[PDB]
Amino acid sequence: KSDFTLYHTWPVRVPRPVTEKLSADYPLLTGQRVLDALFPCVQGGTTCIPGAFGCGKTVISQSLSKYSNSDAIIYVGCGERGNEMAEVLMEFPELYTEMSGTKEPIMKRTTLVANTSNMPVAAREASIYTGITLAEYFRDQGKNVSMIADSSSRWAEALREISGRLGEMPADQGFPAYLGAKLASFYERAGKAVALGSPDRTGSVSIVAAVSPAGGDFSDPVTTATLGITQVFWGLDKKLAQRKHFPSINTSVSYSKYTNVLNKFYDSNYPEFPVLRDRMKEILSNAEELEQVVQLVGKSALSDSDKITLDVATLIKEDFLQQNGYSTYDAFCPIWKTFDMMRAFISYHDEAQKAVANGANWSKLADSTGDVKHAVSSSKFFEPSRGEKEVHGEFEKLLSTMQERFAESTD
Amino acid sequence: FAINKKAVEQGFNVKPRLNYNTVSGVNGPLVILEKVKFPRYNEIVNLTLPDGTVRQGQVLEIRGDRAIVQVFEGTSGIDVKKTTVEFTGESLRIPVSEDMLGRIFDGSGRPIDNGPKVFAEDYLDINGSPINPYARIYPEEMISTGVSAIDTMNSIARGQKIPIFSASGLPHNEIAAQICRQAGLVREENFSIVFAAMGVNLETARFFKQDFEENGSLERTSLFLNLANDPTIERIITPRLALTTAEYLAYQTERHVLTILTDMSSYADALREVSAAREEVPGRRGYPGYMYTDLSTIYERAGRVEGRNGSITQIPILTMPNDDITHPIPDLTGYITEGQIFVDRQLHNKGIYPPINVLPSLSRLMKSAIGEGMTRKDHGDVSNQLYAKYAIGKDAAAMKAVVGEEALSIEDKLSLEFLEKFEKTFITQGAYEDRTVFESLDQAWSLLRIYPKEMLNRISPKILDEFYDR
Amino acid sequence: AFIILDEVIKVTNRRVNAIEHVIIPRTENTIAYINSELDELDREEFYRLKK
Structure with missing residues (x-):
């Protein structure tokens, strides 16, 4: 029927x-x-x-x-x-x-x-x-x-x-x-x-x-x-x-809440992703806390480390977290490109804190490096769709050149 | 043509109507009937007070044989023995004809210019069916208003709806008059202008009638006036009459219309008053729970259509109670609409005309009108650069007043210089000064000469290399 | 004494400016917001009783 x-x-x-x-x-x-x-x-x-x-x-x-x-x-x-x-x-x-x-x-x-x-x-x-x-x-x-x-x-x-x-x-x-x-x-x-x-x-x-x-x-x-x-x-x-x-x-x-259950995927593909995420979030939170006082104390009693933290936070908030909506280069940032940019930013901050750790003054380093900041801030323009390995090599050599410059510019 | 000759042939018909001398109570602005013989929801009736003065009403509920009628022109003087109603067997309809242009009507849409009746070509319901979204096309055009702050930092594409938030005492009337006097497509001033003012004082009406008369625009316009002393209930009908007239004109005679609604705050107040007469559940701050839908059915009547050429653009003027952008009326108005221009009180105290700040204003359809083929290719991001620099100037000035002038790096000094000039020379302009977009963009570039090329990051390097040096 | 007095006056004036400009208005705005919320709740209670 x-x-x-x-x-x-x-x-x-x-x-x-x-x-x-x-x-x-x-x-x-x-x-x-x-x-x-x-x-x-x-x-x-x-x-x-x-x-x-x-x-x-x-x-x-x-x-x-x-x-x-x-x-x-x-x-x-x-x-x-x-x-x-x-x-x-x-x-x-x-x-x-x-x-x-x-x-x-x-x-x-x-x-x-x-x-x-x-x-x-x-x-x-x-x-x-x-x-x-x-x-x-x-x-x-x-x-x-x-x-x-x-x-x-x-x-x-x-x-x-x-x-x-x-x-x-x-x-x-x-x-x-x-x-x-x-x-x-x-x-x-x-x-x-x-x-x-x-x-x-x-x-x-x-x-x-x-x-x-x-x-x-x-x-x-x-x-x-x-x-x-x-x-x-x-x-x-x-x-x-x-x-x-x-x-x-x-x-x-x-x-x-879906931050840990992705550990399997990360381990299969990107083992160090969560560590970098946590470190970046810590950087941003610390920068917010440090700036919370400068609004009524002035940036006078800020050590070199605090100044570097604020500079890195501003760099991140200006470059990493601005997608500029529609364009030919940044409209759909693949996962690998985001991961490489993440690693590059964290490495930049780490080396900046390392060089100043040995007492070398950061104020001179500001213009002694010069090109490092521009390189990291313009890395976002790397055109996707050009090959996973294509920009992989460029991002690989970027941080190598950065750390070589820091070692040389340690003077 | 035959199709024209048949649409009206049904007019030749006579339909008598009843008279009920049976009222069974009155309360507030409502009146209750009895034994009504098949009511109709949203009908129109004609009260005939014992004095001999006619009024008008509209049914709101119908039970078995009762009809609840709300009266427009108050309810005092009514009696349960000598009054008389008369059911018209229809909703409320307006007589329209393309000869309305150049005339004046009051809140109820009847002439007050010592002229004859409209002698219509057809009757239209004040309400209207929604527009089939599959039959709507987005603007892809631009209007040159001649105001730099409006024509460069924001933009207006014909077929768009943009409010004008302004406090009480600020010259939003002057801005609106200038815009309507001084608007044309960017390479027309043929914009037929319908105008509807609700809840205004005599001085405002006189001013608006004056401005449209000396500019030679009164021969292509149509005014609906509902002053402050007119009956409160009628303020709900007026915007619907104006919009029905605009829809007829545009979508059935192929001409581009521009509409102004002088005071939406009065409309909201009237809605709240009529609601509180009944017992509807209130929203925050007492306004009705369904005000959002009511506003939407007023705003969402603009735009273009696939098979037509007309396009009606709205510029509703709205007044915030206490300069509070979180008040319900601005919130829903900007949720329904697409962008809004903000008139600033602070800039007004410094004698800056138009006192328009740019940070809290927006234009959704700017990103489509601008680009290439209509303006220079720099327009898209020069606005972003100016936005960023203005925002930096604001907080630099804010910091200057706390720590003093010791921690202000060169960046802050340049930002403050830019902030001062951007208001004292760019935003400000005269009340009769045109500014083509080319000139405004040239001036905008002139204000970025302060900054060295190396830190204008929001802007593209290609544009800088080709314009920053010229 | 000149140097010490300069330092002390600078710090005290800075603190006074900060308190005047970015403390009082914040608290005033908070008070106004709470005041509005209280009436917002009162209206709903009134409406329930009316029903």
Whole structure:
């Protein structure tokens, strides 16, 4: 009594059944240097990008959709400005990515669900369940997909509006009492898993939300509710955006829980990655602490080591963590290039502290080296796509020349 | 043509309407009817007070046989014995025709220029269906406003929506008048201008009528005025009337329109007032919970279309309560819109016109309009360099006032010199001075001569080598 | 005495300038923010009781 065509339907509020859940242990390569280096994400993990009223929260999503290493993408727009869709459906058919040859269209790999801030309110909720059911479907075919949700706080606003319309007790700032349960049951659909069926294939879903708190505070009930359930978090700063410093991530408040489970991948490929990451984070934190006093003491009682620490921190914040968005050279920094730049910066700082360790004055070294700082600051221009071994040799010889110069310039 | 002759043939029809002399209460600005015989949600009625003065209303809820009507022109004087309603069997519609240009209408869209009625070509609902996103195209153009701070550091592409945040007492009116008087495509001044002012004093209306008259622009414009003493409820209709007129003009006669909304703060206040009359759940600071959607359905009506040539550009003027960018109204206005120009109080106290600071202002579609084929190839990053140097000047000056003038390296001295000149010569300009983008960029380069080439890092070396020496 | 007095006056004036310029306004802004938050909570409590 059953006839099956080439298609079938499915209720949207019932997650599709799966054989068993597994642990995601393969990194998701974004392309952005800061995200890959300090706050990595894993293929099958969640994330938040709390906006701060126009701080380039679309650049991150744009890059993620353009260059992520996923077999499919499902870009969802809930409460979108409406103009953006007109740009994302014009750029893609004019851009290409290569996987088994250069296939000119990227649109062949993407579907879009659009619900602008103008269209009816009640359809905001039904724009994310529809968005994620397709992602689950494509997972069932053993493909690594990734859903890039737009503002999820607008969904909460729609929930509040309808709740108030019916008439019922609000919990916080009007939001209904059951907000905390709607979100969790949505984020819980993410993650790697083994599909249900005979041929024994595997897939994954990796959602990346983006909340839009009122004002700029992270006390919004929407914000404080996702941070309780997510696994990665990427704050955003306003002044950094106002200075044209993109990406505008706040490196002192963001964090990532998928920092150790990637040890297997690093050992397979890049054994010394985590050590360099920790050392750089320590450098930045120390620089922040040291600068915390210069604002009211003046840079008078600063030893040579502190001055070098501040100089290195400024160098890093100006070169390493600025991706300059779109260009021909720094648009998608591969993992190896980021690793080599990381090692070069750490080696520069180490040698600078070594030479001054023996009493040699750093002030003279400042202009005695001269070319070392320019070399490290211009290393970011090395053109990718020129060969993994191509720039590998250049970065190999760069640090050798640097340490030879330091030994010679030790005078 | 036949298609024209059939769209209106349905007009030749007569449909009588009922009169209900049955009211069953009044409360606040609301009125409750009874035994209404198939109400319709969002209808229009015509109250006829016992005095003989007509008013107008709009249903908001309909139960089995009750209709709750809110009245525009207040509710006082109404009686439950002699009043009389009359259901028009329709929503609210505006009579439009391309002869509206050069006339004046009040808050309710009826002439106040001692002229005749509109003698329309068709009636249009003040609301409008959203635009199919698949049928929208992004600007790829640029408007030369003649203001260096607006035409170099930011940019305006026709089809874009840009607010103007300004405190109370600052000359945002003068800036808007200058922009509308002095705007053209970068190599037209044929921008038909619809203008809607809500919650303004008599002096502002007189000033705006004066400025449009001496510049020879009053023959291609259309003004909707809703002064401060007019009924409060009508302030909600006015922007919808103005935008409906603009949409008709642009998308059905192929002409480029530019729209001004004089005071969105008054609109927000009216929304809050009407909401509090009912018992809707409030958002932060008391504003309604759904204000975001209501603002969105006003702003998101600009842009271009695939099969048409018209394009309507918005310049809503908004006033912050206490110079607080974290207030709900600016927050939602800048979440919905794409960029916004900021008028600064601090620069105003020093007699700098236009008192525009550049740090807190943004223009989303700048990166597309600028480039090559329309301006010089340096425009893309000279703005970034100026941004960085201005930001450095700000904190250098801030540091000078704490530690004194002992720890200011040469970098800080150059930054302070740049900060002083960048405000005293570049931002400032006259109230009748044009500035083509070429001249503005030349002046901008002149201000980077202070810095030696070796530390202008944000800028590209190629541009430096070809322009830094000329 | 000249040298010592110069040093002492310099340090004290520097400290006074720092306190005046980058301490008081920060605390004032914090106080204003907290004051606003308290009323924000009061409004919600009032609304619940009204319902």
